[PDB]
């Protein structure tokens, strides 16, 4: 999708993530594990819920609707009363088919963006202590135990504390 | 006996969606009659397993 995060540079999706929509699976000395990143997950949900409600605020409460079926063959006037309606319906449908399309295209592109946004936000936070593996996994270059890891997940990770360790693991 | 704003000749229908396809004849504050019988608006991300 526009950004290449989902359906692309992130191989496929994690079917075992039920807490939320965006996440962190890891591996270190203290085994492996997963955790869902909420500040993101809401972010998307917000936008959808939001356009959902934009999309539905209308019900054509418009006046006397003419007769639309007809019992007898009449001519000019009956003919115009069908043409008018026929034409109305054809547009309303064109509108209708285009809305779903643009919206849906957007919804995808939007959820893509948020993935990428997470992945950037994280890499920045990791200033000079890991390298992008390529597949949307990192290589943290020190000994980061389950304590430390969560710091990175919920923002509190101070890079300087490690750097020394990781600079040396990278270029020695 | 039942509440329902929107009448068709086929019976009542609800107006919670924006588009109906039940009958172009319609009394009350009814979703607009479109030709398609289904239009799905996506509310999640792309699925990939």
């Amino acid at each position: 999708g526009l950004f290449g995060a989902i359906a692309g540079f992130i191989e496929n999706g994690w079917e075992g993530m039920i807490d939320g929509w965006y996440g962190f699976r890891h591996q270190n000395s203290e085994g492996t594990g997963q955790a869902a990143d909420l500040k993101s997950t809401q972010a998307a949900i917000d936008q959808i819920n939001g356009k959902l409600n934009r999309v539905i605020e209308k019900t054509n409460e418009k006046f006397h609707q003419i007769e639309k079926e007809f019992s007898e063959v009449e001519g000019r006037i009956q003919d115009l009363e069908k043409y008018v309606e026929d034409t109305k319906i054809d547009l309303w449908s064109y509108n209708a088919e285009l809305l779903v399309a643009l919206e849906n295209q957007h919804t995808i592109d939007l959820t893509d963006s948020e993935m990428n946004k997470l992945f950037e936000k994280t890499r920045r936070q990791l200033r000079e202590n890991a390298e992008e593996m390529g597949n949307g996994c990192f290589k943290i270059y020190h000994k980061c135990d389950n304590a430390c890891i969560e710091s990175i997940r919920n923002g509190t990770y101070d890079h300087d504390v490690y750097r020394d360790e990781a600079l040396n693991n990278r270029f020695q | 006996t039942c509440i329902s704003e929107c009448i068709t000749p086929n019976g009542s229908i609800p107006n919670d969606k924006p588009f109906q396809n039940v009958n172009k004849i319609t009394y009350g504050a009814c979703p607009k009659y479109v030709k398609q019988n289904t239009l799905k608006l996506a509310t999640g991300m792309r699925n990939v397993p």
């Epitope: 807490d19 500040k39 917000d46 959902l52 409600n53 539905i56 | 919670d16």
Partner: antibody, heavy 129, light 112 residues
Framework: QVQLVESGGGVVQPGRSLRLSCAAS????????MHWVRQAPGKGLEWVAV????????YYADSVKGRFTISRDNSKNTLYLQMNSLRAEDTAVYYC??????????????????????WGQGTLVTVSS | DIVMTQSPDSLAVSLGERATINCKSS??????????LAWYQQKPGQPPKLLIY???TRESGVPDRFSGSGSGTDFTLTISSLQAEDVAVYYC?????????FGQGTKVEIKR
């Protein structure tokens, strides 16, 4: 305008059931979430349940987990709350409250609710033998 | 559970002077430039009426002397001059993560 009106509490022995009802009027009930929030006697506010407009996401506060069941009837415009296996700790006045957020998407246990927009009459539930 | 701590507990000020209350959160309840905190008045034998939402907007009915303020993790309700139809408990609430939680409550009486 808006108006919520609660129903059917009172005395109820421990271990036995009861069910409350909030009868909403003056707004588009079906497009809003609803909550139950209780209040111990001369104490404070606890949150008890939420049920989305869908009727298909519902979460309960831990104290009343799996004894209580929050139920909703968007045709008859009224919110229910089944109270099975009650006990002392549950004595409180019980209030329905309207969510502020329109067609909320409670896809998850933690997602953010809206503020509590209008509240009901209140209804007393006593739990003693 | 996010712990909402209110302070002080009881208050009291001379009918027509200023009164002021604090809600302290277990963590940021701010998110995309909205502060998901609300404030409720509750007089006795009655439910609560909504005083303020999104940290600092007055609900339509409320008069202009009530004011929410704050952002992130400390908030402060303010009655600019306490008229006598204010004596109630005052409850702050967060709705940024389910379970919504409330403050303990600040009873405000009249100083005399």
């Amino acid at each position: 305008q808006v108006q919520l009106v609660e129903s059917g509490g009172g005395v109820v022995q421990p271990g036995r059931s009861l069910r409350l009802s909030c009868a909403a009027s003056g707004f588009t009930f079906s497009t809003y979430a609803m909550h139950w929030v209780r209040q111990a006697p001369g104490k404070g506010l606890e949150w008890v349940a939420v049920i989305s407009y869908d009727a298909n996401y519902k979460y309960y506060a831990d104290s009343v987990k799996g004894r209580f069941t929050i139920s909703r009837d968007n045709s008859k415009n009224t919110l229910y709350l089944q109270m099975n296996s009650l006990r002392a700790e549950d004595t409180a006045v019980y209030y329905c409250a309207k969510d502020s957020q329109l067609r909320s998407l409670l896809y998850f246990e933690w997602l953010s609710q809206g503020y509590f927009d209008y509240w009901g009459q209140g209804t007393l539930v006593t739990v003693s033998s | 559970d996010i712990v909402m701590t209110q302070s002080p507990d009881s208050l009291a000020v001379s009918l027509g002077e200023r009164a002021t209350i604090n809600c302290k959160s277990s963590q940021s309840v701010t998110f995309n430039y909205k502060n998901y905190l609300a404030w409720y008045q509750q007089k006795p034998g009655q439910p609560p009426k909504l005083l303020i939402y999104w940290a600092s907007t007055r609900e339509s009915g409320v008069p202009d002397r009530f004011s929410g303020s704050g952002s992130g993790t400390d908030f402060t309700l303010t009655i600019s001059s306490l008229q006598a139809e204010d004596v109630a408990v005052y409850y702050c609430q967060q709705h940024y993560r389910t379970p919504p939680t409330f403050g303990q409550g600040t009873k405000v009486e009249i100083k005399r």
